[PDB]
């Protein structure tokens, strides 16, 4: 859990794994002998599976069942296991792996694993399941393709339903707070697309990449807003127009000069900055926006260190105007 992050590397981590049945069978035999009730060794593994390796739970089960039943044999094991079986909420990776399994969507598999079960599986974590499905629905080998249907058509149908589910989610978290639509969302975002592309995973299940991309986009939008409001007194546009139209020319007037005349451009570049109330941090932020064939990372790295040092010294040795006071 994230709450435990502070304990990352300040303690020796000791992991305890679910003990196997063989490591506890002797204890169960001793308890059964001491408490005068017959316990078949064969059914012990089934009991352990029922409690998922919880010795406290299995001892409690034995105590509760021994009050009226004096023999835990193969006959009554099924009923006892079904009555005492645990319900552990699956984690996002397990939810993604199970939802994309093609077996559960077959006729028989549908009979065993029902639609209600799938909706409950989604609700086990209703904030990450749709993200996991959207992340992993393109990386399977479908086993539910209809006669003549190709993988691409099923993927397109799943994407259409994911878009509809996104619209429903926007409705849910609006000012109306329509949380009663949570079940419907479950169908549109997780169950239906998975049923369309259910099968075997073609590779490792991956966590959603949408959160990191969203945070990066928010950071870049904040930087763009600061740059726009620093240059707002000189330009005539909104922030989008600044990103799409002004920044290329700003680069041609701020980066290219350093790559042609070396350290002779410094003053000129500074002048341009002074004309738009720009700063060194705005310089870097602007240089960090371009994509495709205009990525500056290598270009900036290849600039001689002396030129950059001279630019920094010249900027730090001169006064500059302030567009916004106490930003």
């Amino acid at each position: 859990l994230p709450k435990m992050r502070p304990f990352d590397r300040v303690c020796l981590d000791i992991q305890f794994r679910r003990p196997d049945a063989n490591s506890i069978k002797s204890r169960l035999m001793t308890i059964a002998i001491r408490e005068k009730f017959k316990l078949d060794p064969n059914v012990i593994d089934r009991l352990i599976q029922t409690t998922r390796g919880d010795i406290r739970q299995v001892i409690n089960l034995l105590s509760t069942i021994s009050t009226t039943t004096k023999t835990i044999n193969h006959e009554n094991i099924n009923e006892i296991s079904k009555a005492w079986e645990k319900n552990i909420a699956l984690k996002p990776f397990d939810i993604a792996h199970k939802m994309l399994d093609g077996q559960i969507y077959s006729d028989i598999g549908s009979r065993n694993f029902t639609l209600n079960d799938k909706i409950a599986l989604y609700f086990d974590d209703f904030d990450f399941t749709p993200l996991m499905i959207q992340e992993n629905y393109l990386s399977t080998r479908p086993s539910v393709l209809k006669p003549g249907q190709s993988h691409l058509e099923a993927v397109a149908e799943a994407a259409n339903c994911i878009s509809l589910g996104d619209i429903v989610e926007k409705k849910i978290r609006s000012s109306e707070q329509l949380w009663s639509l949570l079940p419907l969302h479950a169908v549109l975002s997780s169950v239906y697309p998975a049923s369309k592309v259910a099968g075997h995973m073609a590779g490792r299940i991956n966590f959603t990449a949408w959160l990191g991309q969203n945070s990066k986009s928010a950071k870049y939008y904040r930087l763009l807003q600061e740059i726009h409001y620093h240059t707002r007194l000189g330009t005539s546009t909104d922030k989008i127009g600044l990103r799409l139209d002004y920044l290329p020319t700003f680069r041609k007037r701020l980066l290219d000069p350093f790559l042609k005349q070396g350290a002779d451009a410094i003053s000129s570049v500074i002048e341009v900055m002074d004309d738009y109330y720009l700063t060194k941090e705005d310089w870097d932020s602007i240089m960090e926006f371009f994509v495709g064939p205009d990525v500056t990372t290598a270009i900036i790295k290849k600039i001689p260190a002396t030129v950059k040092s001279g630019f920094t010294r010249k900027y730090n040795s001169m006064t500059h105007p302030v567009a916004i006071y106490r930003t």
Partner: protein, 352 residues
């Protein structure tokens, strides 16, 4: 300063295209004491903000161009602290409430009202020290306002018309609700003609002493801009800088990086139609979105680039445009843009 900003006209008499609109604005400014609320709609980069500033300069004095930036605090119901940057002059205030997203409503319900419910002290040009004129509020990207903010604007526009007048600017009136349009005088702002763009570019070139082999180069820039004058001027400056301030008939037309990426994505989609191609397209879309490229712009440019492919037939283009319409509607009503973009790309891949 860049040529796009250094040569922007500062008065109605300095405008150079759409003379009919200039005459209409002069007629509106002739008797400004009863000027209604204005809504200027038109294509981006045509000169809407320039014309709004020129109209204000015609109503008030040149002082409208003496701008200053201030920061205003706001508190939400949860005590969240929000900042709004306001550009103001001694005669008007400019605001972009969409900067606060869903919180824009608060700005309408707190800031604008505060301006409209009080008088102001004017110690210059007024003997009594109190202003004897209505205050103008410009709302930028009015089409980005949420429905709640637009609803809040309604009664404010009517109750305090004696003290406040609104001038809104937009690239499309479709997102504006009907009551707001009913409350405004709508002004269409057509894009400049190719000849007018060429004339402006020639004037800029003459002022900047840029060597030009033939005037047709300017013409070539004018078509590439698709009526966007800001793009035209910026492209002229970029071309001049890329050829040592000496342009030739062979001077290639420069395109922005995001447009190049979108064209490459179009080529990839046309060439390869598979799930792995879809994953690569998803990666490209994420890269484009992470760098402040609006989703609607991406969808529009991708759709038109696809429709510009010579190897596609009429059925493919019809399917592409239908899917583009459907997923534009989906984007308008959704949160996660990548979902709708991926759905559109998958549908296009299936159709091809």
């Amino acid at each position: 300063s860049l040529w796009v900003d250094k040569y922007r006209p500062k008065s109605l008499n300095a405008l150079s295209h759409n003379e009919e609109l200039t005459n209409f604005l002069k007629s509106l400014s002739d008797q400004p004491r009863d000027l209604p609320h204005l809504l200027l709609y038109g294509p981006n980069g045509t000169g809407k903000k320039t014309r709004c500033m020129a109209l204000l300069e015609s109503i008030f004095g040149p002082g409208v161009y003496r701008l200053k930036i201030d920061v205003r605090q706001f508190v939400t119901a949860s005590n969240r602290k929000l900042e709004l940057n306001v550009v103001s002059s001694p005669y008007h205030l400019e605001i972009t409430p969409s900067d606060m997203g869903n919180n824009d409503r608060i700005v309408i319900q707190e800031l604008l009202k505060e301006v409209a419910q009080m008088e102001q002290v004017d110690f210059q040009d007024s003997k009594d020290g109190l202003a004897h004129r209505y205050k103008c509020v410009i709302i930028n990207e009015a089409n980005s306002l949420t429905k709640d903010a637009q609803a809040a604007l309604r009664r404010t526009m009517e109750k305090y018309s004696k003290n406040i007048r609104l001038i809104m600017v937009c690239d499309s009136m479709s997102p504006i609700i009907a009551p707001i349009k009913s409350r405004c005088l709508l002004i269409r702002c057509p894009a400049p003609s190719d000849s007018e763009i060429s004339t402006i570019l020639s004037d800029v070139v003459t002022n900047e002493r840029i060597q030009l082999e033939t005037k047709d180069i300017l013409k070539r820039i004018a078509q590439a801009s698709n009526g966007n004058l800001r793009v035209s001027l910026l492209m002229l400056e970029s071309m001049a800088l890329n050829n040592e301030l000496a342009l030739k008939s062979s001077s290639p037309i420069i395109k922005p990086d995001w447009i190049i990426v979108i064209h490459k994505l179009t080529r990839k989609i046309v060439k390869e139609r598979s799930v792995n191609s879809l994953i690569e397209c998803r990666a490209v879309l994420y890269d484009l979105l992470a760098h402040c490229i609006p989703a609607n712009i991406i969808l529009k440019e991708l759709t038109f680039s696809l429709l510009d492919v010579e190897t596609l037939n009429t059925t493919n283009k019809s399917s592409i445009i239908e899917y583009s319409s459907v997923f534009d509607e989906r984007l308008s009503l959704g949160n996660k843009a990548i979902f709708h973009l991926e759905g559109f790309i998958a549908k296009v891949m299936c159709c091809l």
